[PDB]
Design an enzyme around this catalytic site. Structure first.
Site, PDB file in Angstrom:
ATOM      1  N   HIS A  16      54.535  37.034  42.044  1.00 40.40           N
ATOM      2  CA  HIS A  16      54.540  36.632  40.650  1.00 40.40           C
ATOM      3  C   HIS A  16      55.945  36.440  40.089  1.00 40.40           C
ATOM      4  O   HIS A  16      56.198  35.431  39.429  1.00 40.40           O
ATOM      5  CB  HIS A  16      53.729  37.658  39.868  1.00 40.40           C
ATOM      6  CG  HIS A  16      52.303  37.663  40.332  1.00 40.40           C
ATOM      7  ND1 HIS A  16      51.702  38.805  40.834  1.00 40.40           N
ATOM      8  CD2 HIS A  16      51.428  36.634  40.421  1.00 40.40           C
ATOM      9  CE1 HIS A  16      50.473  38.442  41.185  1.00 40.40           C
ATOM     10  NE2 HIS A  16      50.272  37.137  40.964  1.00 40.40           N
ATOM     11  N   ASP A 116      53.110  33.377  33.147  1.00 40.88           N
ATOM     12  CA  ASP A 116      52.407  33.591  34.403  1.00 40.88           C
ATOM     13  C   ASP A 116      50.886  33.529  34.248  1.00 40.88           C
ATOM     14  O   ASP A 116      50.354  33.688  33.153  1.00 40.88           O
ATOM     15  CB  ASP A 116      52.779  34.970  34.953  1.00 40.88           C
ATOM     16  CG  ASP A 116      52.944  35.059  36.449  1.00 40.88           C
ATOM     17  OD1 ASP A 116      52.999  33.984  37.119  1.00 40.88           O
ATOM     18  OD2 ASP A 116      53.058  36.184  36.954  1.00 40.88           O
TER      19      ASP A 116
HETATM   20  O1  LIG Z   1      58.918  40.617  53.726  1.00 42.46           O
HETATM   21  C1  LIG Z   1      58.759  39.830  52.794  1.00 42.46           C
HETATM   22  C2  LIG Z   1      57.496  39.478  52.214  1.00 42.46           C
HETATM   23  C3  LIG Z   1      57.458  38.606  51.196  1.00 42.46           C
HETATM   24  N1  LIG Z   1      58.593  38.027  50.666  1.00 42.46           N
HETATM   25  C4  LIG Z   1      58.516  37.035  49.565  1.00 42.46           C
HETATM   26  O2  LIG Z   1      57.664  37.516  48.544  1.00 42.46           O
HETATM   27  C5  LIG Z   1      56.650  36.536  48.222  1.00 42.46           C
HETATM   28  C6  LIG Z   1      55.342  37.020  48.794  1.00 42.46           C
HETATM   29  O3  LIG Z   1      54.601  35.907  49.363  1.00 42.46           O
HETATM   30  P1  LIG Z   1      53.238  35.556  48.615  1.00 42.46           P
HETATM   31  O4  LIG Z   1      53.440  34.607  47.481  1.00 42.46           O
HETATM   32  O5  LIG Z   1      52.232  35.216  49.650  1.00 42.46           O
HETATM   33  O6  LIG Z   1      53.058  36.995  47.952  1.00 42.46           O
HETATM   34  P2  LIG Z   1      52.009  38.150  47.645  1.00 42.46           P
HETATM   35  O7  LIG Z   1      52.467  38.777  46.369  1.00 42.46           O
HETATM   36  O8  LIG Z   1      51.751  38.903  48.910  1.00 42.46           O
HETATM   37  O9  LIG Z   1      50.690  37.350  47.270  1.00 42.46           O
HETATM   38  C7  LIG Z   1      50.102  37.488  46.010  1.00 42.46           C
HETATM   39  O10 LIG Z   1      50.793  36.712  45.043  1.00 42.46           O
HETATM   40  C8  LIG Z   1      50.770  35.266  45.250  1.00 42.46           C
HETATM   41  C9  LIG Z   1      51.328  34.648  43.988  1.00 42.46           C
HETATM   42  O11 LIG Z   1      52.236  33.590  44.280  1.00 42.46           O
HETATM   43  C10 LIG Z   1      49.357  34.747  45.544  1.00 42.46           C
HETATM   44  O12 LIG Z   1      49.459  33.389  45.956  1.00 42.46           O
HETATM   45  C11 LIG Z   1      48.680  35.586  46.623  1.00 42.46           C
HETATM   46  O13 LIG Z   1      47.343  35.157  46.859  1.00 42.46           O
HETATM   47  C12 LIG Z   1      48.674  37.027  46.154  1.00 42.46           C
HETATM   48  F1  LIG Z   1      48.025  37.840  47.102  1.00 42.46           F
HETATM   49  C13 LIG Z   1      57.213  35.223  48.787  1.00 42.46           C
HETATM   50  O14 LIG Z   1      58.144  34.560  47.946  1.00 42.46           O
HETATM   51  C14 LIG Z   1      57.940  35.702  50.043  1.00 42.46           C
HETATM   52  O15 LIG Z   1      58.969  34.814  50.408  1.00 42.46           O
HETATM   53  C15 LIG Z   1      59.846  38.308  51.188  1.00 42.46           C
HETATM   54  O16 LIG Z   1      60.871  37.820  50.743  1.00 42.46           O
HETATM   55  N2  LIG Z   1      59.857  39.204  52.228  1.00 42.46           N
HETATM   56  C1  LIG Z   2      43.230  39.979  43.217  1.00 40.86           C
HETATM   57  O1  LIG Z   2      44.427  39.327  42.876  1.00 40.86           O
HETATM   58  C2  LIG Z   2      44.436  37.967  42.522  1.00 40.86           C
HETATM   59  C3  LIG Z   2      43.174  37.225  42.462  1.00 40.86           C
HETATM   60  C4  LIG Z   2      43.190  35.852  42.115  1.00 40.86           C
HETATM   61  C5  LIG Z   2      41.940  35.084  42.051  1.00 40.86           C
HETATM   62  C6  LIG Z   2      42.020  33.684  41.684  1.00 40.86           C
HETATM   63  C7  LIG Z   2      43.283  33.141  41.404  1.00 40.86           C
HETATM   64  O2  LIG Z   2      43.312  31.741  41.036  1.00 40.86           O
HETATM   65  O3  LIG Z   2      44.391  33.868  41.476  1.00 40.86           O
HETATM   66  C8  LIG Z   2      44.370  35.199  41.825  1.00 40.86           C
HETATM   67  C9  LIG Z   2      45.644  35.932  41.877  1.00 40.86           C
HETATM   68  C10 LIG Z   2      45.649  37.307  42.230  1.00 40.86           C
HETATM   69  O4  LIG Z   2      46.900  37.965  42.267  1.00 40.86           O
END
Ligand SMILES: O=c1ccn([C@@H]2O[C@H](COP(=O)(O)OP(=O)(O)O[C@H]3O[C@H](CO)[C@@H](O)[C@H](O)[C@H]3F)[C@@H](O)[C@H]2O)c(=O)[nH]1
Ligand SMILES: COc1cc2ccc(=O)oc2cc1O
Length: 475
Positions: A16, A116
Site C-alpha cells: 500500500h 488509497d
Molecule cells: O522482500 C520483499 C518483499 C516485498 N517487497 C516490495 O513490497 C511490495 C510487496 O509486493 P506486493 O504488492 O505483492 O505486496 P503485498 O503487500 O504482499 O500484497 C498486498 O498488497 C498489494 C497492494 O499493492 C496487493 O496487490 C496484494 O494482493 C496484497 F496481498 C512490492 O513493492 C515489493 O517490491 C520488497 O521490496 N522486498
Molecule cells: C484481504 O486483503 C485485501 C483484499 C482485497 C480484495 C479485493 C481488492 O480489489 O483488493 C483487496 C486488497 C487487500 O489488501
C-alpha cells in the site's frame, strides 16, 4: 497554469505504501505537480521506516514531502481472529480525525486528494474542503469490477460464494471461479464481507479512479468499466489506467545477495518471495525447501518464520526480529547442503534490484500486484503461488489470460503442494522450452508496458487526463 498541489493518502502496509510513493514520484517528476503524502503507519513495521528513509532524501528538490501519520490504537475493536482487511479499515477510520487536522494546517490547500483503496473512508475530508477526490486502486481492473459489482451479487446469491457451482459473471468481464474469490468473499458472516461491500459502493462517490494497470494488459475489463450498461448503472465516473507503476532500481552495491548473483549464470536463478506479508505453513515450507534442492536449480529465497494460521496475519507488523534462527524451520542441514546452490535470505530483500538482475531467470511469487508488475516490467516469468487478498484472481489472470505464469494443479491454499510438484514447476520454468516461451510472453508484456508509459500511449495520457480533470474541477 498555476501549479497544482495533490495530497495522496496511504493505508498501512508495504503493498500500500510503495505504489503511493511511486505514484507521487511519477506525478512530481513528469507532470510538475507538488505532492504531499499522508502515509498512515502502525509504527510497528521497521521496513516502512527504513523505506521512508531512502526516498525522502532522494526526493528533496523533487517537491515531494512525506508526512507520516501514526494510526491510533484499535485493540479495543479487534481480537486474534479479526482479519487484516478489517484491521486496515479500522486503522484508517480511527485515523480520520488526524488527517483532517493535517490538511487544515497546510498552507497551500491541496487541489486534489488521491486516496488509497483503504482510505475511501476519508471522502468526508475532501467533501468538507470541497477538493477533488480520486481513489487509487493499486491492482487489477478485474478486481475493481468485482468490488463495484459485488453490491449486486450481494442481493442475488443467498448462499456462500464458495459454495457456488457456476462462476460469478461480472458483466462484461472474465467469469470468476468460486475458488478464486478474494479473501473477503470467502465468508459472508464475517465483518470483512460487509466492509468489502461498503468499499464497492464507496468507489462510486469519488470523482474518478486510478488503476495500476494498462489498457493493453486487461482491455475488456476496462472497456466494461467504461461502457458496460449494467456496470455503468453503478460506476458513473472516469477510470484512469496509469500503470504499470513500479519503483526505480537504486544502484546499491554493498548488497550481499547481489554480489552472489554477480557470480551466477544469466537467467539461471529462481527468485522466491511471498511478498511483504505472506508466510507459509511449516509443512508447505518443508515441501518447498525440498522442492528447491530436488530441482537442482539455483535460488534466492526470502524466508520468514512459518505459521499454521493465516498466511497474511503478519502483514501489519514486519518489525519483529525474535529468537528463531532460520535453520529452525528449514530441514536439517539445508543451508549446509544448498550452500553454493542457493541463498536463504531472512525477512527482507531488495526485490527490484534482484528482479532487474541478469542472473534472475524466474520468480516464484505470491501474486501481489506490485511484485507481479516488478516481474513483468523486467520480463521475468513466474510461478503463481497465491496466498491471500486478490492474489487468487491475479494468478488466474497471469496463467489463464496473459500466459506469463505457471502454477500447481491445485491452489496451495486448498491443498499442500508436494516437493515433487514444486521441483517439477521449477525445472519447467527455468530449463524447459515451455519455460522459454513463457519468458517470451513476459518480455512482450514488458515492451507493452514500456509503450504504455512512454509519451503518448495509454497510461501517460491517462495522467494528462487526470490532471486536466483536476484543473477543470478547480472551478
Ligand atoms: O522482500 C520483499 C518483499 C516485498 N517487497 C516490495 O513490497 C511490495 C510487496 O509486493 P506486493 O504488492 O505483492 O505486496 P503485498 O503487500 O504482499 O500484497 C498486498 O498488497 C498489494 C497492494 O499493492 C496487493 O496487490 C496484494 O494482493 C496484497 F496481498 C512490492 O513493492 C515489493 O517490491 C520488497 O521490496 N522486498
Ligand atoms: C484481504 O486483503 C485485501 C483484499 C482485497 C480484495 C479485493 C481488492 O480489489 O483488493 C483487496 C486488497 C487487500 O489488501
Amino acid at each position: 497554469s498555476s501549479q497544482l498541489h495533490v495530497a495522496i493518502v496511504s493505508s498501512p502496509g508495504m503493498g500500500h505504501l510503495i505504489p503511493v510513493l511511486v505514484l507521487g514520484n511519477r506525478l512530481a517528476t513528469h507532470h510538475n505537480i507538488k505532492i504531499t503524502i499522508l502515509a498512515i503507519t502502525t509504527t510497528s513495521s521497521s521496513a516502512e521506516t527504513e523505506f521512508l528513509k531512502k526516498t525522502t532524501l532522494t526526493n528533496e528538490e523533487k517537491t515531494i514531502e512525506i508526512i507520516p501519520v501514526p494510526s491510533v490504537d484499535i485493540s479495543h475493536l479487534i481480537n486474534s481472529s479479526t482479519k487484516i482487511f478489517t484491521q486496515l479499515r479500522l486503522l484508517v477510520r480511527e485515523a480520520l480525525p488526524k488527517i483532517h487536522s493535517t490538511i487544515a494546517s497546510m498552507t497551500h490547500r491541496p487541489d486534489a486528494l488521491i486516496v488509497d483503496i483503504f482510505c475511501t473512508q476519508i471522502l468526508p475530508i475532501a467533501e468538507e474542503f470541497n477538493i477533488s477526490k480520486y481513489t487509487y486502486h493499486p491492482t487489477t481492473a478485474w478486481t475493481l469490477a468485482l468490488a463495484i459489482y459485488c453490491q449486486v451479487f450481494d442481493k442475488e446469491i443467498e448462499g456462500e460464494y464458495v459454495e457456488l457451482k457456476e462462476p460469478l459473471k461480472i458483466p462484461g468481464c472474465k467469469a470468476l471461479r468460486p475458488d478464486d474469490v478474494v479473501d473477503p468473499l470467502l465468508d459472508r458472516s464475517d465483518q470483512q464481507y460487509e466492509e468489502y461491500v461498503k468499499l464497492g459502493k464507496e468507489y462510486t462517490d469519488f470523482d474518478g479512479i486510478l488503476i495500476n494497470t494498462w489498457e493493453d494488459l486487461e482491455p475488456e475489463t476496462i472497456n466494461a468499466l467504461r461502457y458496460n450498461e449494467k456496470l455503468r448503472l453503478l460506476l458513473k465516473v472516469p477510470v484512469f489506467p496509469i500503470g504499470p507503476l513500479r519503483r526505480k532500481v537504486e544502484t546499491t552495491l554493498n548488497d550481499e545477495v547481489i554480489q552472489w548473483l554477480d557470480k551466477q549464470n544469466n537467467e539461471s536463478v529462481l527468485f522466491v518471495s511471498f511478498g511483504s506479508g505472506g508466510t507459509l505453513s511449516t509443512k508447505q515450507m518443508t515441501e518447498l525447501a525440498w522442492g528447491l534442492e530436488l530441482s537442482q536449480q539455483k535460488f534466492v529465497w526470502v524466508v520468514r518464520p512459518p505459521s499454521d494460521g493465516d498466511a497474511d496475519s503478519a502483514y501489519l507488523n514486519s518489525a519483529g526480529k525474535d529468537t528463531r534462527d532460520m535453520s529452525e524451520y528449514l530441514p536439517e542441514g539445508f543451508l549446509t547442503r544448498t550452500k553454493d546452490m542457493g541463498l536463504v535470505v531472512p525477512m527482507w530483500a531488495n526485490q527490484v534490484e534482484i528482479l532487474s538482475h541478469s542472473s534472475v531467470g524466474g520468480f516464484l511469487t505470491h501474486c501481489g500486484w506490485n511484485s507481479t508488475v516488478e516481474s513483468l516490467t523486467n520480463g521475468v516469468p513466474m510461478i503463481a503461488w497465491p496466498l491471500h487478498a486478490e492474489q487468487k484472481m491475479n494468478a488466474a489472470m497471469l496463467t489463464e489470460e496473459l500466459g506469463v505464469a505457471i502454477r500447481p494443479a491445485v491452489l496451495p491454499t486448498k491443498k499442500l503442494v508436494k516437493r515433487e510438484e514444486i521441483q517439477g514447476m521449477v525445472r519447467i520454468l527455468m530449463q524447459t522450452k515451455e519455460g522459454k516461451r513463457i519468458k517470451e510472453k513476459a518480455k512482450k508484456l514488458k515492451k507493452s508496458a514500456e509503450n504504455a508509459l512512454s509519451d503518448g500511449g495509454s497510461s501517460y495520457n491517462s495522467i494528462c487526463e487526470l490532471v486536466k480533470d483536476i484543473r477543470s474541477r478547480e472551478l
